[PDB]
Amino acid sequence: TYKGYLIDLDGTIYKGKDRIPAGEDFVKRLQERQLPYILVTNNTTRTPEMVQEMLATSFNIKTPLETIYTATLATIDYMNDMKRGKTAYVIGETGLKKAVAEAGYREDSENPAYVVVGLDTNLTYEKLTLATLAIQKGAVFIGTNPDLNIPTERGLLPGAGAILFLLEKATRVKPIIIGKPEAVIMNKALDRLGVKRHEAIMVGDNYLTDITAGIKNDIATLLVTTGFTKPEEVPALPIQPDFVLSSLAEWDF
Amino acid sequence: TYKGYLIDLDGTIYKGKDRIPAGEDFVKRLQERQLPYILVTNNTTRTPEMVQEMLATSFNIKTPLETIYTATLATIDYMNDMKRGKTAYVIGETGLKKAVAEAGYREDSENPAYVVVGLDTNLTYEKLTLATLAIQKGAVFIGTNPDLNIPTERGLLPGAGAILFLLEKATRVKPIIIGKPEAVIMNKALDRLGVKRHEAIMVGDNYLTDITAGIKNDIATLLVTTGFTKPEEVPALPIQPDFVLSSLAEWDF
Amino acid sequence: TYKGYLIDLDGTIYKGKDRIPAGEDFVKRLQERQLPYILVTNNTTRTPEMVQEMLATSFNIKTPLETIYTATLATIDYMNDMKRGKTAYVIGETGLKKAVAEAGYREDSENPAYVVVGLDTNLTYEKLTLATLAIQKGAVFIGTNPDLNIPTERGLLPGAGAILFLLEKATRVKPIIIGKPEAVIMNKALDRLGVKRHEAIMVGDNYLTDITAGIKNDIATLLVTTGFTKPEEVPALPIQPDFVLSSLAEWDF
Amino acid sequence: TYKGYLIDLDGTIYKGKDRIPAGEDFVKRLQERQLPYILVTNNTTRTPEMVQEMLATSFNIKTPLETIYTATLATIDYMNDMKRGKTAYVIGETGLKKAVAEAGYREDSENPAYVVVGLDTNLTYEKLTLATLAIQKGAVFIGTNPDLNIPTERGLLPGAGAILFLLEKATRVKPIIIGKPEAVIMNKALDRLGVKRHEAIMVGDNYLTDITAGIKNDIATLLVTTGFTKPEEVPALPIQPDFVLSSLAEWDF
């Protein structure tokens, strides 16, 4: 019997601008059984509030603010835990840069204690240079998420992970990456879930980001053939998830 | 105030055949304060009993059997957690192969549910072939530890990580690695420690295996300039440990 | 107008134990026009003589011994060119070890000037250890071919490239690799061809080993959908070969 | 007896704004013996003319324009050799973009036949996106040089190779890289040199870019402890160059 649920957002409880009624129902059912759950996303542009509002406004999902855990939150928690200088140079969208500054880390492009990098659609050589120099001086190099690509209406564009690799190559230092499928975001989400590791299960549509997040961190997994990972691709997966479903509606608590 | 201690064995509380009185004293002091602690090692050849006996016989350290957590134990716990077939093909020393079989996984070189690989000083092409074929058929590919080398009286020889890479290249599947600095061994050790993540601290002499284990998994770190990582090398480290000491004797609980 | 032809053996002018009449005819046609050509193979087990005999006995192809250029020959030529000690430690089949010794490099497992590695179906940890130690001491690390796998009647087994990666990881030194698609074998084959680079063309069935060999080394390419690379896979290739044919019979000199 | 000389520019015959009289003399001596030589640089910002003028104006070196071979020239030669569409999307300084357009490849950011990438100190996400999309559609992905860093008065900044890796990760296609130490620039430089491979020798100050260029491509090497690779670092080199000198003045033709 699973006591807690970790759930991916986009691709699982909705897809793009389109919704997935089974997904919305899944959350409602969880709320009805009063089963704890946390929505985990690698998105670093929208704040928890924005995410909460989007869910209620566009997908009939009304969930407490505390159930929304993003890579931005995980990154700040990690920064607070490691406790090094209260300065950071951040590469990313305005939202991420704002969240970090408001969390107490003022922007310092010269000798920051931390260099945090997420997707920045306004990336410039100068920003990369600033980060490279700071990392070389000893700043703690952190990546918000490893995704090599970001799927947009325009196509498969460069993701945070691609930018991170550029910096890794230029500085020779491997960034500590927070988001799925890495350990930190999963550990913290698990912590908020308030359940023991073997009592939780990660629910998602993306094999590489969600299911691997489970397998790699010793957490049970439920893969829904909706979203990214197509149903025909499952037989070829290197490691089968613990459960595979075509719709969350098939899940029985 | 740190409430629990994760501690590396070789290089920290002793070195090679030589001992480190400060290290032995560190454990004794922990025992006196009744502070929980777990000795974590990536070694897969000696059983917990063997390790316990070695400590008492050669280094005046008498510690309960439950305080000794190895990569072998972590690997078996993981195998038990994932719960797939009770079969496995194992590459490693007789000790590792025995522990896995006795844990309930009979050797099956044809269609094992798991393929477990650790250091095997008797590695042969045939064993690699057996593992490769099994992995290709869908077996869950697990590595006991990532170390690229194993330091012996003969010199820096090929470690489990080097063998793992051969297999990764041959099968195109990345192994889930259990030992330090990866998540699973640290999560389980933390679990046995019985303390919250932010209340623990990882103590070691090796920056890459012990300190990185802390940083990567959001656990405080204490680096002792004894062992592997020389004291002159510390200024150049990409991420400074939370604490650096020349001797464990300098530590004040 | 192409003046010289570099041609892959297995998969192009024959496949496995099965033959390809169009392939055999291709060579015969070349001989008739008196167009220079060199057969290039990454195989390190059969000597040029063995290869020559196999061609005549099993595939009606009678070609001069000098038209057969293997990775073994290329490797020895390279060793002779670099001119370092006349000693080498070799990992591979008896044929390769013999060819190197007969080329003037006596086996020295302690301080060889060169460490040469090709596929060895009798690979052992001891041999890997011998190679690792020798490389660490400064021996020039050479790989006969990069192939990650070797297709056998038993299936896709570990190739020379997989063994090479194990050593690369264990020693931290990248091996200089001779065979296709690397530069050395192509440069030397081109040299024996007696034609200028832009006047030659590489003919093969394997995109990764033969066509990439051309593209990477600025040599025209002719891909035959026979062998390894299936015809449906061609549209997805990252770089299209200069020419694509379903049969060599379609080629017009 | 060496009949031809391939020589690195910066770090060898001068360093930064500072000059190296021994270097300048080396070229003059070559000119006196009428020994053929080609100056090879991975720099893609200055045209051959600019390079020629700089040498004469700032370092008393007057050399024919044809003796200056850059990665830009090598890249264009390669593009002309492969002969695919006369369109290309280029990421780099204005100089590189201009040279490619003037070589007959008009800028097409939608469906270019080639996507060429060199260092661009004005890199933007949009340019990376344009390149990523084009590569995905089948454009031939070319990198001017592999250098992970570019040393500037500001420090060790991101080089062309770092940008190339971002793109490789985002598209999953490995770029064919032209500059040192890869094969194409060396083959073409050798061609202009007008000598046989074993009769030439690569002279440089950088082990990774110049000496490796020799070793990897079977060309003799002369390492001058001036520039990048410090003299104390030589004993630890994985492969010793054929010759090591503290000053070019020590060289005897």
Automatic annotation (TrEMBL), chains A, B, C, D:
Keywords associated with the record: Hydrolase, Magnesium, Metal-binding
Entry keyword Kinase: no
Protein origin, superkingdom: Bacteria
GO-annotated cellular components: cytoplasm
Gene Ontology MF: a single term: metal ion binding
Cofactor dependency: Mg(2+)
Protein family (similarity comment): Belongs to the HAD-like hydrolase superfamily. NagD family.
NCBIfam families listed in its UniProt record: HAD-SF-IIA, HAD-SF-IIA-hyp2
Name the record gives this protein: Phosphatases involved in N-acetyl-glucosamine catabolism
Organism: Streptococcus mutans serotype c (strain ATCC 700610 / UA159)
Organism taxonomic ancestry: Bacteria, Bacillati, Bacillota, Bacilli, Lactobacillales
